[PDB]
Amino acid sequence: MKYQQLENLECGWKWAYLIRKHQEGEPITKYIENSAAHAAVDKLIKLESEPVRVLEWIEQHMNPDLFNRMKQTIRARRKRHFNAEHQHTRKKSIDLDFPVWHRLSALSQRRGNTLSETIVQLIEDAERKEKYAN
Amino acid sequence: IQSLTARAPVWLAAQDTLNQLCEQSGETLASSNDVTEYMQQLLEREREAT
Amino acid sequence: SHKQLATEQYRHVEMARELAEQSGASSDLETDHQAASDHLNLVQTAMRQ
Amino acid sequence: EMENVQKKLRKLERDYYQIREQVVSAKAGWCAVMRMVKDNGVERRLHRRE
Amino acid sequence: TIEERVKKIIGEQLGVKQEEVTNNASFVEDLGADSLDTVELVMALEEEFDTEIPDEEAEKITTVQAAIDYIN
DNA sequence: TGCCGTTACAATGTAACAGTGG
DNA sequence: CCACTGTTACATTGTAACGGCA
Ligand SMILES: *P(=O)(O)OCC(C)(C)[C@@H](O)C(=O)NCCC(=O)NCCS
């Protein structure tokens, strides 16, 4: 356990995620009958502003197949929330043309390094080549 | 330094509470005895106003 | 540590310089000793004759 | 042997560099919040020094 | 000109505007920046110019003008 | 194993720059 | 000039797959 978990924050995250999924059409609840599903969704909607009861709501009506996805989404949300405080711990997202990405991933898989490590090593070698020439 | 640091938070909270309490009053407190006379004046004002 | 390392580098430079001086002295001594060996051989030959 | 220590110094230098950007960014962010909170918020309300 | 760096950073580090700082005044007492604030200011100046300033030289920047005097 | 950090993506939304033709 | 288009460099959120560890 590296990042401390805060209930009033992660519960709001879970509520927002479930509301988003419901608005997206995902079946939040395990009830195939539409009446029970709608009733549970209404309970959730009126359940806003409550961690201790949204957790119970999840335990009681949550769709079995979404547990893993919700858990990993909350994991990622927690990690990003804690890393977004400092500049050096943040992550920069870019888009690479498919050939360039293909070659870079080929190198990374070949050497066992990650994309960041592979690019760092390559840049260091480029600098070393510059110094060699210079 | 560590002993003073351990003592610190209690003293700081005490100072803040005392400052708030005194500023709420028109007077500024400076001694335990002074707090006692303030209590006596409070009792006098209470027994009058009642 | 930066100042300490720079100063140690300067000390290193000084010792390297003095050992270069000793290397030059060694070369000069080598020439002189070549001459000395030549002299020894000449004296040996003269004694034999 | 000393060239390794020089490389370690370079590592420490980059770490110092990083800490320095962190600190300067923190102060840049702080500036504005001080400026706004000087509307009596910071006097005693927010600054719970305890 | 290049001084726009200093006269900018100073403000960004002290909450004052570009014209607020006066060359005759002193950071330590005439700008409200305490020891920690002045350390932060000098270290931000160091960061901005990608250079280094030892403690001894750094301590002689208590006045507004010095911030450019060592720079230019 | 199940949780928890971590990586490498995918999909969509925006700001900024460079071009192109009316 | 001006508008509309193409492109790059991000952000934001979600997900699956590894690998560490109780
Ligand atoms: P002041 O009450 O703002 O406190 C300043 C400070 C003691 C926290 C510190 O920032 C400071 O000004 N230190 C003086 C310089 C110093 O100690 N340098 C050490 C270099 S290893």
CA of A117: nucleotide with nearest C1': F7
How is domain A98-134 classified at the CATH fold level? Arc Repressor Mutant (1.10.1220)
Of 1.10.287.130, 3.20.20.140, 3.20.20.150, 1.20.1270.380, the CATH number of A7-89 is: 1.20.1270.380
Q: Is the CB of A16 under 7 A from strand F?
A: no
- Residues forming beta bridges with residue A62, ordered by sequence position: A29
Cα angle C14, C17, C23 (rounded to 5 degrees) comes to: 145
For B15, nearest residue in chain D (alpha carbons): D50
* Structural domain count of chain E: 1
Q: How many CB atoms lie within 10 A of CB A47?
A: 16
Question: CA A19, A20, A23, A27 torsion: positive or negative?
Answer: negative
Distance CA B40, CA B38 (A): 5
Both tokens of A112, joined, read 């066992």
CATH of the domain at E52: 1.10.1200.10
How determined? cryo-EM
Task: Single out the residue of A100, A104, A103 nearest to residue A114, CA to CA.
Answer: A104
Q: Cβ distance A88 to D25 under 8 Å?
A: no
Length of chain E: 72
Give the C window 7-46 contacts with D, CB below 8 Å: 8-9, 12
Task: Single out the residue of A60, A28, A24 nearest to residue A41, CA to CA.
Answer: A28
Distance CA D15, CA D8 (A): 11
Domain definitions of chain A by residue range: 7-89, 98-134
Q: Given this chain, do its domains A7-89 and A98-134 carry the same CATH topology?
A: no
Enumerate the residues of chain A whose CB falls inside 8 A of the CB of residue D25.
87
Resolution in A: 4.6
Q: Which domain holds residue E20?
A: 1-72
Question: Under DSSP, is residue E20 helix (H, G, I), strand (E, B) or coil?
Answer: coil
